[PDB]
Symmetry: C3
Subunit: 399 residues, 3 copies
């Protein structure tokens, strides 16, 4: 046969974990902690570590039921295993944060159904299954809801009241994966944000990591090391914010994501030399990288100011989202970010004056606050750019 | 060729009908009536029968034009045929409910355009054609507005102002059909609810039945006998509400669905043994099945109360939808359903309290009305679980 | 290989261009002007022509940087070329309307990223790239926000604050192209109208032309000459408005679109015989075709009035859209269209009345203004159609 080929589908995987064939492997490594599974033929056991054990004390448990999937939160540790010829698939919750005494519970699936991915959010847990069903639970194990997925699930993540799902949307071809995304908000009023929409990916690539920023923005990375974030402001589009391949010292090196922060701007990941993932031991060192958006002509300070400006704007979108959600936020941050953005716009405007691109100055001033346009009028007047000062005055009258 | 294989596409079909090659077949069986096709040496004719004899008298029509597709509503009978080498594809409406006297009309389609599916709604009719176009009509045959479909249509259903369409969304593989759903509201304001979104299916299944509950909720069933209903309370997701294979006492059993009622909770279907559908004769008898959400650990009273509670919740979504559309209902139904839901929550809360899962009690109380939380506070106080009574009081203060 | 075949994907193209290997060819021809590329081994140059040179003077440019894709607006000429072993892909804007000191700017893309499609809108420009990225620019060459494309782009168009993208949504089969569309608004509030939703197409067709009505409604045409327009009044569905094959007097004829107008109702296109597109020499001439919605029984006066009525309705939907977007509009034209529609409804009602389909008269009266209903009541009274007059009176009372 001479034609193009259907791509072999990516299997489901729990985000931030390493392959099952390893005796000692990571089940989940995130901003909360690290879960290591030690599955020797001698011993099948689990090691739970918090980056702060005041959350809950360092804990080790025998993996008697042979859990293979796990998740970690501020509230609870969630564990899951497949069905066997003897067992239903089981979901085991260790709710350490409870104020009631009985801090564990287990749920057994309907008989032929298997868990394939899980995730945790504020006071709730979710599990996706081989029935192409998604099951919702409270953190205390009340069954909340059940519904059908659009296709074979790939991975899941949870943050606050947000549930982020990725699944197979069709047949991919010639190395591409046909993947779709569902994003839901589970508030007093409940919304589906993304209705199985197509998920942007690099050519001949597969999904490598998903999750949220600590600020609660959906994010993901592909096998080409391209980090993409949900741009809520820009019509819920997907903006690339970093290309990790730039820093691979040898090209067979890779970066394995651990967490994301918008403020401080931090990408937390582990450098893996000659491997797409880290070994469990000797304990890898997490590396922290800054984001850098793929702006053109970035060798110019003009491009750098544009990149810095939009990077700043994007990373502050979570404050508006939180405000719209009625979640509390530090408005001083928004004032400061606005000021930084006005300073960047003013620097770009001043440079544009010196470049004689006064039309471009008005374009930059269109993005300014009214106070910054007043300052721009004063600067332009002092610079004897009176045509620009007039144009800016008309803009100020329009604002 | 060594690759996986594209699934052969499901051919379009009228819901609640039986296959064309049968000389005697059901053109449509719904909650209104039955339409039989007789292509016999005695007579090539179509026979219409109403379940409630008071609606209209039984009617017989000679099928000279060789109609092949049909539909039935409270208002009219709709018939359609393909083009021949000489005939247009024709749409024939017999609008018996009219107050005017000239109670029929026929419309001829353009050349090379064939009707592929039809359906009836309140005062309007819709027809999808091999031009990949959808045509709309008033019940009296004014042409309403035409638009284009995303792919080859599979089936359609109408209820009130709602139009529910399913079509081929792409190429499915290895036995999966690739189906998409489009849902429109044809009120004074016209809206599109589902934008060609993917339709959930059981693996390697195909669509078997499509329609609405009598209460006007979109619903469908696949070839694996899984009934799915639109979950308006959950961001317009698809929730399974029954698995007929539990009552497939033999694997050759099948349940040929005829209609759905949320109040009383009834699935109306015909049991078929050795065939996916019944023969025309001897006249089959309607069987009633109950709904059952596929909740986990359902042998437990805890799981049973959860399943009952959420099943009750889902079936009451139609009252909210009716209210959003300005349509009315007996509010005592809503009060009673709410009360039953409170009683189920109260029983689950009492069980959780006696299990000393007091955290789970507060999680259940989160779903209670304020009066039910007050009653839960009184129960907890009378049970002398004062920590729980305190937590419930905090919740009551919060609401 | 025994199974059905995945279709090869349609290559990207600029709308209103002609194929690249033609030494003398059209780069873009729209309602603003004509741009021609003349690529001799001795001379590679581009000719710019305006349909009104007061906008700017017709201009000849030496194509030393070897641009291959281009666009034209009221404000600027946009040019683009691919990278080489020595060059980035470059975007060159000739901003002829600028009042600042230079009417040009150039942007060089990141390494190994190539421009694949471009378009212009009101004060902004957009470029889609081989990185599956969408890059936005102001008309003066600020860099605006960047995001990821759903798949390989096919073509783009812009009008006002609207940006219209089409891309490969999946793998088509047996001659079909699987295409998806994204439609975004770039106002002070930014929105996504179509979430990468499927694009309707004629069977086995491919996309031939894309753009907007001069009135600002998205429209497109496939390789079968079927013109479709976005129906904002019908939940943003796609309505066909013309089959150009009816005017293929020879059926090797084709119509190559240049522009679209709702008011006056005009399809502006070039007739091409034995080719889907015109050569640059001898200088072609535009033909104007009228729209013709594919309504049934169009040989009848009834069908003609229905076609005219809906055609009139559709071509004035933009007035409401523009008003909601704060654009100014011809209220007089809205009154004119209202009058056309009342006259057509009155004629259809009178015809139905004389055909004694009195129920259909009431159906038509539902679409009338209250004044037209009162006039219809008086007509019915004078006709002594008192039952119909009563039904119409009850409808008038209902409004």
């Amino acid at each position: 046969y001479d034609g193009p080929m259907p791509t072999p589908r990516q299997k489901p995987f729990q985000s931030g974990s390493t392959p099952l064939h390893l005796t000692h492997r990571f089940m989940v490594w995130n901003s909360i902690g690290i879960i290591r599974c030690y599955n020797d033929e001698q011993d099948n056991a689990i090691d739970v570590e918090f980056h702060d054990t005041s959350i809950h004390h360092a804990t080790h448990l025998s993996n008697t039921l042979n859990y293979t999937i796990a998740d970690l939160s501020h509230e609870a540790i969630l564990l899951a295993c497949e069905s066997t010829d003897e067992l239903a698939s089981k979901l085991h919750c260790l709710h350490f944060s409870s104020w009631d005494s009985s801090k564990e519970w287990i749920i057994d699936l309907p008989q032929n159904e298997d868990i394939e991915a899980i995730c945790l959010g504020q006071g709730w847990a979710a599990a996706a299954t081989s029935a192409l069903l998604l099951r919702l639970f409270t953190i205390g194990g009340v069954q909340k809801e059940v519904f059908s997925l659009a296709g074979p699930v790939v991975s899941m993540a949870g943050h606050g009241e947000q549930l982020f799902i990725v699944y197979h949307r069709g047949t991919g071809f010639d190395g591409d994966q046909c993947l779709g995304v569902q994003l839901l908000e589970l508030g007093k009023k409940k919304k589906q944000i993304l209705h199985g929409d197509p998920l942007p990916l690099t050519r001949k690539s597969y999904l490598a990591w998903i999750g949220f920023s600590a600020e609660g923005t959906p994010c993901y990375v592909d096998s080409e090391g391209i980090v993409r974030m949900l741009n809520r402001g820009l019509g819920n589009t997907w903006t690339p914010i970093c290309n990790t391949r730039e820093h691979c010292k040898g090209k067979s090196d890779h970066y394995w994501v651990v967490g994301i922060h918008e403020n401080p701007q931090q990408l937390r990941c582990i450098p893996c030399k000659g491997s797409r993932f880290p070994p469990t031991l000797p304990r890898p060192a997490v590396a922290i990288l800054s984001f850098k958006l793929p702006y053109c002509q970035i060798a110019t300070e003009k491009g750098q100011m544009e990149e810095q400006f939009w990077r700043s704007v994007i990373f502050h979108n979570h404050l508006d989202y939180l405000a719209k959600n009625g979640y509390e936020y530090e408005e001083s941050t928004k004032n400061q970010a606005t000021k930084e953005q006005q300073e960047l716009l003013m620097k770009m405007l001043a440079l544009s004056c010196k470049l004689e691109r006064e039309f471009r100055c008005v374009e930059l001033a269109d993005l300014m606050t009214q106070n910054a346009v007043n300052l721009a009028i004063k600067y332009a007047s002092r610079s004897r750019k009176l045509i620009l000062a007039q144009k800016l005055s008309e803009l100020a009258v329009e604002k």
